[PDB]
Ligand binder design. Structure first.
Ligand SMILES: Cc1cc2nc3c(=O)[nH]c(=O)nc-3n(C[C@H](O)[C@H](O)[C@H](O)COP(=O)(O)OP(=O)(O)OC[C@H]3O[C@@H](n4cnc5c(N)ncnc54)[C@H](O)[C@@H]3O)c2cc1C
Length: 501
DNA sequence: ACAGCGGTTGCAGGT
DNA sequence: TACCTGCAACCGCTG
């Protein structure tokens, strides 16, 4: 009796998962030939390629738990195999007699190399491999192809291309498995019958002191529930313009579906379709680039360009990337990293980020601009690695692309527009409630200088119960000097990059 | 050929 | 209010 395997890596969902649905329609088509083994490989070869904070482990733990619950409703379960895909796949091809493997494709360099090996090792043992493209609405490979073998490097050019492509159908949830007993215990399940069960928090999070409030639980269920809440107000959705959403509202002012889209708990395609249904009922609506569909198209865009370039997360060797002489400065990196910059707005954001693992897009803008071209002149690659650790939604392509944007290394080139770490947040939080929350030491300062504590006299600071240099740090740089100064470094860097290009 | 246009989300100082 | 402006002038795309 041969086994059918779906491999979860992303696409952590039952709904709109063609790679998964094939296995289930295939098993039900000829029941009694097949066992079904939906697996997720807990890969230690991931921790040596990337950084993973506690908040995101909890998210993964919860997603895997929810994914297991849902598979059980389909008379199956999730099998969590510990091991590196190299050691794991040849063993399970053998002991399970794998007739077919399926998975959702990924453009990310680690997974491309991982996939090739498995694609090859599957052909070595005659296993059929059927991959699907469902993490994105459009296939980056086809987007590139229709643009004559090149990735379009502007948003509008990108839209023109994808409008010429038809959208795959959004699949529902797969068929409940019929007349299908549980698979026989392999060599590993015989030693330990719980070997492939869901990791507990204790097992997965080796670091529980670094967890913050569980504001965004993982899993398909919470993803679907949150989308429905996010789209309940159809007038809000129609008129949605990203630039008018607050970075410092205590409640998130956007959908916060990014972590769900990153793990594939929510299908980008389903989400796109729910929006398109709202568009019909609400013909007066925002367009790209600022609308919600437009935000999905940004995801698509960055995935396309990234797909074409394996050095996309890196300045050197990156076809898109401006070559800029960033400084090494450990003290300033360390201060930015732990929200100890002395600019309360920046510090507020980095602390929310660390504690909760999500921050608003424009909050990311503010801190990224500050780290790179705005103030500290530190490479975007560093900011990337921090975000990569702290973000629930860390996504290789998205993190890289947006970091290159904010440093004006690629895609964005108007480096004379520099965010003010003092001024930016005032429009949406003039009282500084956001700062009072994440920088509690300053929570008794008057609004007139909570963004600029260094304007308080010493006696003022004492009366506010927080002296600068002791209870909260002196600002590590003077924005009003360094941003003009950096603008001229950028002018200089661009001149050099032209004189090659 | 290269001036001119648009570019998801700047700031300060303006009506 | 939501769109003036000037800043010193960037990119890729277009015709
Ligand atoms: C320096 C920097 C790093 C970033 N790193 C990541 C990352 O690691 N992973 C990630 O998902 N987002 C990243 N973002 C992009 C963006 O900030 C988030 O996708 C967004 O804040 C998610 O919140 P939301 O779900 O409420 O987005 P919404 O405003 O509700 O938009 C809906 C969805 O569209 C997509 N989207 C929105 N904005 C962008 C964007 N600018 N680029 C690409 N896709 C977008 C997201 O999937 C998002 O969930 C980064 C932005 C910057 C400034």
């Amino acid at each position: 009796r041969s086994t059918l395997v779906h491999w979860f890596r992303k696409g952590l969902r039952l709904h709109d998962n063609p790679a998964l649905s094939h296995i289930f329609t295939a098993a039900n088509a000829a029941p009694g030939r097949y066992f079904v083994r939906p697996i997720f490989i807990l890969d230690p070869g991931i921790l040596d390629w990337m950084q993973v904070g506690a908040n995101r482990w909890r998210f993964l733990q919860q997603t895997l738990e929810d994914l297991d619950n849902q598979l059980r409703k389909l008379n199956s379960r999730l099998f969590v195999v510990r091991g590196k895909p190299a050691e794991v796949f040849p063993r399970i091809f053998k002991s399970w007699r794998v007739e077919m493997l399926t998975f959702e494709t990924d453009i990310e360099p680690y997974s491309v190399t991982r996939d090739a090996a498995v694609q090859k090792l599957a052909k070595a043992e005659g296993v059929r491999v059927e991959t699907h493209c469902s993490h994105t609405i459009y296939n980056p490979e086809l987007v590139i192809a229709k643009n004559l073998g090149k990735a379009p490097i502007t948003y509008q050019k990108f839209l023109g291309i994808v409008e010429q492509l038809k959208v795959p159908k959004v699949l529902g949830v797969p068929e409940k498995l019929k007349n299908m007993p549980t698979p026989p215990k392999d060599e590993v399940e015989q030693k330990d019958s719980a070997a492939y069960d869901c990791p507990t928090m204790k097992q997965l999070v080796k670091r529980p002191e670094e967890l913050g409030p569980n504001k965004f639980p993982g899993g398909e269920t919470e993803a679907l529930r949150r989308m429905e809440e996010s789209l309940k107000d159809e007038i809000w959705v129609a008129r949605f313009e990203k630039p008018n959403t607050a970075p410092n509202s205590l409640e998130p002012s956007t959908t916060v579906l990014s972590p769900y889209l990153k793990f594939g708990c929510l299908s980008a395609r389903l989400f796109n379709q729910k929006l398109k249904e709202i568009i019909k009922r609400q013909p007066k609506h925002s367009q790209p680039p600022v609308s919600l569909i437009g935000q999905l198209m940004w995801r698509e865009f960055y995935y396309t360009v990234a797909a074409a370039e394996p050095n996309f997360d890196r300045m050197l060797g990156n076809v898109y990337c401006m070559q800029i002489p960033w400084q090494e400065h450990p003290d300033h990196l360390e201060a930015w990293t732990h929200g100890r910059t002395g600019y309360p707005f920046i510090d507020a954001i980095m602390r929310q980020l660390r504690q909760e693992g999500w921050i608003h897009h424009l909050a990311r803008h503010a801190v990224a601009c500050f780290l790179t071209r705005g103030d500290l002149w530190i490479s975007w690659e560093e900011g990337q690695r921090v975000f990569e650790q702290l973000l629930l939604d860390q996504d290789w392509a998205l993190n890289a692309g947006n970091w290159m944007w904010l440093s004006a290394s690629a895609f964005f080139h108007q480096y004379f527009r520099v965010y003010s770490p003092v001024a930016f947040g005032k429009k949406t939080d003039p009282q500084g409630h956001y700062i009072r929350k994440y920088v509690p030491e300053l929570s008794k300062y008057p609004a007139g200088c909570i963004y600029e504590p260094w304007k308080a006299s010493l006696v003022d600071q004492r009366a506010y119960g927080c002296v600068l240099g002791t209870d909260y740090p002196h600002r590590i740089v003077k924005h009003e000097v360094v941003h003009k100064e950096n603008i001229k470094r950028m002018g200089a860097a661009y001149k050099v990059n032209r004189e090659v290009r």
